[PDB]
Amino acid sequence: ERVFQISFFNLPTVHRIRDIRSEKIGSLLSISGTVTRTSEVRPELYKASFTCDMCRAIVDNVEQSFKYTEPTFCPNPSCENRAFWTLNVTRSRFLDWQKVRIQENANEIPTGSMPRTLDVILRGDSVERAKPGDRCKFTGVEIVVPDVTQLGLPGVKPSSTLDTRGISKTTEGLNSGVTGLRSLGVRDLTYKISFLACHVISIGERDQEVFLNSLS
Amino acid sequence: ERVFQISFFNLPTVHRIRDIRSEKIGSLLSISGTVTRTSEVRPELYKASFTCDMCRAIVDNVEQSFKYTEPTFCPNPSCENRAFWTLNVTRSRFLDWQKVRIQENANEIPTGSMPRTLDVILRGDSVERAKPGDRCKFTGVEIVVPDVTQLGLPGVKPSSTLDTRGISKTTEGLNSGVTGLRSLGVRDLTYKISFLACHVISIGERDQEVFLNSLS
Ligand SMILES: [Zn+2]
Ligand SMILES: [Zn+2]
């Protein structure tokens, strides 16, 4: 089946990057900004499929939110199993994924200002439609992204937040992190605001036979 | 559904009680003898139905051979459960059951003999068709019946072969009992020969309107 997408446009009012508050999280918005960095078109895991190690039973359509999620309770028999699955990478569905960095326009920047930034996520057919240096108007939903490293990623590769640079001492303990959840353990979960975009617009052949076709 | 029965008769040769050997176990035979005792028509459990204590899931059609058998693996993988079921006596199917004791005929008995005996099982529609003192010809299958008391009956009522009389010392250790099975444990299982019968035959109103109906 074709994973469908719905693209909204022509919203009444447009927002700037400095109007982004947490009270619009989950709402449909439109924003404007200048693109300054784009990444590769990576494949994102959409509908996962696994096989039980012992039964060989097949599970399909396991939704994933922000981290690699395997199924829990086994399928149709008596077999008891909490883990040890094998992803069937061939059966699983994937999608295109891209991350772009944008900053404020030259006019919205005050007289003395260090420009604010944001992370916009393009997915599906909207990849590569924003090029660095251009001025583009995005529209989508404002979301919040947690730190998955302290959410217990399967591999040892995360290695509990390995770092190369020193974090800010000013916001050490000032950034309010929630605790209590069993998956976290004694850890503290943190959040940051990002944007997810569904529609992108920009606001800033010598063959005779094919040429005659286009014109009215 | 009607639990059906098949009744065979008119076999070529008939056997006496003293021709019963273990090498015909499972075969279709016909025997003759004089009935000397009959029991009540008790209900036998045919198709059992249970409900899981926690899930409340319903299992049905659990076959039983010679002892009260509950299911093992649950209907749903989720809840794990090896025991603690509740028989749904209303949903279960039952059948009629009767045990009759027979002995050898007056002619087949030698000049000096203590008559041999046998246990014949009548089931279904064949109950009460054999009356004590009569001479009847049975036909069915020769089976073997184990001792269920040492097969781990659920209740404490069996109390590991409670007895009121003293067993034979002559056959103490002489009766060959098999061991090794995990259900038995270190116990020894014993067998005895009985007969299961499917067809029985015997070989030894002042109302005018209804009377006129029967005659040709
Ligand atoms: Zn399994
Ligand atoms: Zn259950």
From Swiss-Prot, chains A, B:
One of its GO terms (biological process) is DNA replication initiation. GO terms for cellular component: CMG complex; cytoplasm; DNA replication preinitiation complex; MCM complex; MCM core complex; nuclear pre-replicative complex; nuclear replication fork; nucleoplasm. GO terms for molecular function: ATP binding; ATP hydrolysis activity; DNA replication origin binding; single-stranded DNA binding; single-stranded DNA helicase activity. It is found in: Nucleus. Keywords: ATP-binding, Cell cycle, DNA replication, DNA-binding, Helicase, Hydrolase, Nucleotide-binding, Nucleus, Phosphoprotein. The modification Phosphoserine is found at S113. It comes from the Eukaryota. Present with 13400 molecules/cell in log phase SD medium. Early fractionation of eukaryotic MCM proteins yielded a variety of dimeric, trimeric and tetrameric complexes with unclear biological significance. Specifically a MCM467 subcomplex is shown to have in vitro helicase activity which is inhibited by the MCM2 subunit. The MCM2-7 hexamer is the proposed physiological active complex. Component of the MCM2-7 complex. The complex forms a toroidal hexameric ring with the proposed subunit order MCM2-MCM6-MCM4-MCM7-MCM3-MCM5; loaded onto DNA, forms a head-head double hexamer. Interacts with MCM10. Belongs to the MCM family. Acts as a component of the MCM2-7 complex (MCM complex) which is the putative replicative helicase essential for 'once per cell cycle' DNA replication initiation and elongation in eukaryotic cells. The active ATPase sites in the MCM2-7 ring are formed through the interaction surfaces of two neighboring subunits such that a critical structure of a conserved arginine finger motif is provided in trans relative to the ATP-binding site of the Walker A box of the adjacent subunit. The six ATPase active sites, however, are likely to contribute differentially to the complex helicase activity. This is DNA replication licensing factor MCM6. It comes from Saccharomyces cerevisiae (strain ATCC 204508 / S288c) (Baker's yeast). The gene is MCM6. The chain holds residues 260 to 509 of 1017 of the full protein.
